[PDB]
């Protein structure tokens, strides 16, 4: 009376090694499998599945993959161990605070081990700390880490990556527009790979992200726990335009046999502060939609204030990101300014010594980019933090797993169990 | 999140079952402050217990109310017992014995 069926539609929650698929890059996209030109999406009918974006294994796996790719891209590049020395730094030739650039001279090792060369370089003030003699400096990372120059030819541009599960597994995309993030989601679908998820690292603002379709969406693991960040998703993007107006030519200094160090030389033009602009009339009423959706959770009588970052590292007090290959840190004190009962120029500071993933011992020297860098990105969300009659919502971030929870919230890996045993009125 | 804990003073004898009512609507924790030694965690969440804490302490959830049933009350329980849901802590009841 028992009957065995192979090919049954049954699945169980599971975790597997998802691989990549994609259509000189840090995230090794050339090595990815060629993705399907037309992805096959099978709308599953009548089926309800219980999702949980905050316990998603895809997010942790993507975090590990991004860190591993960053490590492997830095493996064959130059080691700037010699660059940690005392630097005689003057101010760059300027009238004007603006100590933001320092003209620093040092004795570098040449191709010959028994010779030395007097060279110079423009270093940002955030990349040099003062020792002692008042003109003597050193790179910020010398007393905590070893610095490895990023290869000038590998790009930091986020190329979309499609996370495909192996055969015998599947990914369940929840198509419900109003998705609180967890719980049961009707109208499930099966996909072979996730959508193109750009690996965009940033804090206080999700850039080049996927937008909600129906409404602004507020997603927090617990809206009562302050330690949990509040991921806000925008139904319409807010365009943000950057410029690094400095020309910033580069210059190769041979630090050893077959090892070059690309240093900033003279600036061709005016020494101007970098910035990114956000439209005022859009960012307002974007915060309008956000405060409506926050008052939904916090009651209608609350006063939803938006303050700027309380403190911490530079990576989380400012909207940090990578634009045109240079690492920007924008103030965003004017963005997060209102009580909520023409452009907004946000001044940004560039750094070259970057310690990604909150690590020590793996700092890197982004080489200077020639020309003039510009962003045209689209703010599709925020990472807020509530303060423990009124509720204040400061920015947050730093943990990049929250940056990829906003992308891998629909998806949910499952393991297809094809065997089934049912009673029927048949015998061998 | 709203909390309440009654009574404020409570005297009991040795070898007694004594309950401290404490109503809340969040993940609740129970502590033991010995007047100048910093609190100690006894019961985390409603009912779960901590290492180094004997079974003399125990907790029970019922809708919204929490008990902290301290059976076989020993002389070493002369402390102050307070609740905590996230950032909100109420004054603890001063066990007298």
């Amino acid at each position: 009376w028992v009957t065995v069926y192979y090919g049954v539609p049954v699945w169980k929650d599971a975790e597997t090694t998802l691989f990549c698929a994609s259509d000189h890059n840090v995230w090794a996209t050339h090595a990815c499998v060629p993705t399907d030109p037309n992805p096959q999406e099978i709308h599953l009918e009548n089926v309800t599945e219980e999702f949980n974006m905050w316990k998603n294994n895809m997010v942790e796996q993507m975090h590990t993959d991004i860190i591993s790719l960053w490590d492997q891209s830095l493996k064959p590049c130059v080691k700037l161990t010699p660059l940690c020395v005392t630097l005689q730094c003057t101010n760059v030739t300027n009238n004007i605070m603006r100590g933001e650039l320092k003209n620093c001279s040092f004795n570098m090792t040449t191709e010959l081990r028994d010779k030395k060369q007097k060279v110079y370089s423009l270093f940002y003030r955030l990349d040099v700390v003062q020792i002692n003699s008042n003109k003597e400096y050193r790179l910020i990372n010398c007393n905590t880490s070893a610095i490895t120059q990023a290869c000038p030819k590998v790009s930091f541009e986020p190329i979309p990556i499609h996370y495909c599960a192996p055969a015998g597994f599947a990914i369940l995309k929840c198509k419900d527009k109003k998705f609180n993030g967890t719980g049961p989601c009707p109208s499930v679908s099966t996909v072979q790979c996730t959508h193109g998820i750009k690996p965009v690292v940033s804090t206080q603002l999700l850039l080049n992200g996927s937008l909600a379709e129906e409404e602004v969406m507020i997603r927090s693991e617990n809206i009562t726990n302050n330690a949990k960040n509040i991921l806000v998703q925008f139904n319409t993007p807010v365009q943000i335009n950057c410029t690094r107006p400095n020309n910033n030519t580069r210059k190769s200094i041979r630090i050893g046999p077959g090892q070059a160090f690309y240093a900033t030389g003279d600036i061709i033009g005016d020494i101007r502060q970098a910035h990114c602009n956000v439209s005022k009339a859009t960012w307002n009423e974007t915060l309008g939609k956000v405060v409506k959706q926050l008052r939904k959770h916090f009651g209608n009588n609350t006063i939803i204030r938006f303050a700027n970052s309380s403190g911490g590292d530079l990576e989380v007090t400012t909207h940090s990101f990578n634009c045109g290959g240079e690492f920007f840190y924008c103030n965003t004190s004017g963005l997060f300014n209102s009580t909520w009962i023409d452009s907004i120029t946000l001044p940004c500071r560039i750094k070259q010594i970057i310690n990604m993933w909150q690590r020590i011992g793996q700092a890197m020297y982004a080489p200077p980019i020639q020309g003039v860098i510009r962003c045209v990105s689209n703010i599709t969300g925020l990472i807020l933090t509530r303060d423990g009659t009124t509720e204040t919502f400061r920015p947050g971030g730093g943990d990049m797993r929250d940056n990829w929870r906003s992308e891998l919230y629909k998806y949910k890996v499952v393991k297809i169990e094809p065997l089934g045993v049912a009673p029927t009125r048949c015998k061998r | 999140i709203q909390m309440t804990q009654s009574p404020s003073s409570l005297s009991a004898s040795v070898g007694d079952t004594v309950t401290i009512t404490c109503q809340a609507n969040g993940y609740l924790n129970w502590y033991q402050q010995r007047r100048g030694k910093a609190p100690k965690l006894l019961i985390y969440d409603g009912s779960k217990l901590e290492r180094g804490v004997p079974s003399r302490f125990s907790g029970r959830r019922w809708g919204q109310e929490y008990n902290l049933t301290i059976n076989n009350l020993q002389p070493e329980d002369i402390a102050t017992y307070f609740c905590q849901v996230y950032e909100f802590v109420v004054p603890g009841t001063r066990l007298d014995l």
Partner: nanobody
Amino acid sequence: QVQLLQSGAAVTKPGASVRVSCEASGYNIRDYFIHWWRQAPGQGLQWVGWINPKTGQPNNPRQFQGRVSLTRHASWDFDTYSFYMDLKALRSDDTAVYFCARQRSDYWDFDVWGSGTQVTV
């Protein structure tokens, strides 16, 4: 073992500033927020605020905005982690014992606290 060694009791005057140190050791300090609380004389506990050990992002209530400053400092390889609590516009109201505790899960279980630091104004 898990240890939050606090600093000695300090005395200040109204207007001056006080610093309270919470040198932490014996575990992975990164995965667990450090919360600061304040026991007034003969009162309950009051929430001063948490600091993230990874990013350093502080979080204080409306009372201590622009007033308290939670900072950290990690030594080499993050093995030691000194957490500092600074106050600026100090008053006689703020005479209390400042404890530092380790939130150890989503339930806000403070299984370990500090010895305490009696700030008297």
